Amino acid sequence: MTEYKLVVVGAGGVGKSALTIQLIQNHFVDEYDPTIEDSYRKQVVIDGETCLLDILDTAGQEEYSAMRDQYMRTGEGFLCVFAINNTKSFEDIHQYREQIKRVKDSDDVPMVLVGNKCDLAARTVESRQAQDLARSYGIPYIETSAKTRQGVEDAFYTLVREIRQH
Ligand SMILES: Nc1nc2c(ncn2[C@@H]2O[C@H](COP(=O)(O)OP(=O)(O)NP(=O)(O)O)[C@@H](O)[C@H]2O)c(=O)[nH]1
Ligand SMILES: [Ca+2]
Ligand SMILES: [Ca+2]
Ligand SMILES: [Mg+2]
Ligand SMILES: [Mg+2]
């Protein structure tokens, strides 16, 4: 019936769960409960097509990342998330993309680079820097706030649109 399997990856605390929950459930999770591996499913219309989104929300914490690779293996597209006030999370993106390519055994995997927490003012990653990283990967860069919902739908729907280009 047209199902897209989306996987959200990135460092601990960047807002993977908050983004996914904002998308699927329309509220902001203020507290920080580290994730192991969670999944969500939602039927949505995207560009006139009724489809099923299966979204896997993965662990960013090393301690909780036990079998992440096995969950990533099934994904059709990946949201690579960093936080714009967390320079290390941005620098980590390289490692997530490499892990994705490893598990998919391919150098051509649909992805979108996401800079989250754009509502926050302690920015240490400038838009241009992230744009350049995404350009080097040949993927879109989109900024989001799980708190205000800005860009949230756009990031996930953009990933669906990347998968359709595959
Ligand atoms: N201001 C603001 N806070 C955010 C945003 N997204 C997430 N947060 C906050 O950041 C914290 C971590 O969010 P969370 O979604 O749990 O991060 P995670 O990437 O899923 N963590 P983990 O990898 O451990 O599962 C929470 O306190 C959450 O409210 C955002 O866009 N803006
Ligand atoms: Ca809340
Ligand atoms: Ca492999
Ligand atoms: Mg989480
Ligand atoms: Mg700088």
- Cα separation values, 35 from 97, 116, 148, Å: 20, 17, 22
Rounded Cα gap, residues 152 and 150, in angstroms: 6
- Domain spanning 1-166 has what CATH number? 3.40.50.300
Rounded Cα gap, residues 67 and 103, in angstroms: 12
CA dihedral 9→10→14→16, nearest 10 degrees, is 0
Rounded Cα gap, residues 64 and 81, in angstroms: 17
Establish whether residue 154 lines the binding site of ligand 1, counting it when its CB lies within 6 angstroms of any ligand atom.
no
Placement of tokens 């969950």 in the chain:
71
In terms of DSSP bridges, do strands 141-143 and 111-116 run parallel, antiparallel, or are they unpaired? parallel
Tell whether 12 is in a known binding site: no
Rounded Cα gap, residues 124 and 153, in angstroms: 24
**Sign of dihedral through CA atoms 112, 117, 118, 122?**
negative
Which helix (H) or strand (E) segment holds residue 164: the answer is: helix 152-165
Which residue's C-alpha comes closest to atom 14 of ligand 1?
15
Instruction: Give 21-27's long-range contacts (Cβ < 8 A, gap of 24+).
Output: 21/146, 22/146, 22/149, 22/152, 23/55, 23/152, 23/153, 23/156, 24/55, 26/149
Rounded Cα gap, residues 68 and 71, in angstroms: 5
CB environment 40-79: b (16+ within 10 A), e (fewer): beeebebeeeeeebbbbbbbbeeeebeebeebbeebbbbb
**77 DSSP assignment:** E
Which helix (H) or strand (E) segment holds residue 114: the answer is: strand 111-116
**Sign of dihedral through CA atoms 36, 1, 4, 23?**
negative
**Domain residues of the chain, as ranges?**
1-166
Burial of 88 (0-12, 13-18, 19+ CB in 10 A): exposed
SS3 14: coil
Write out the two tokens for 81. Answer: 């998330």
Within 10 A of 136 (CB to CB), how many other CB atoms are there?
A: 8
Rounded Cα gap, residues 152 and 145, in angstroms: 7
Tell whether 75 is in a known binding site: no
Which residue's C-alpha comes closest to atom 6 of ligand 1?
15
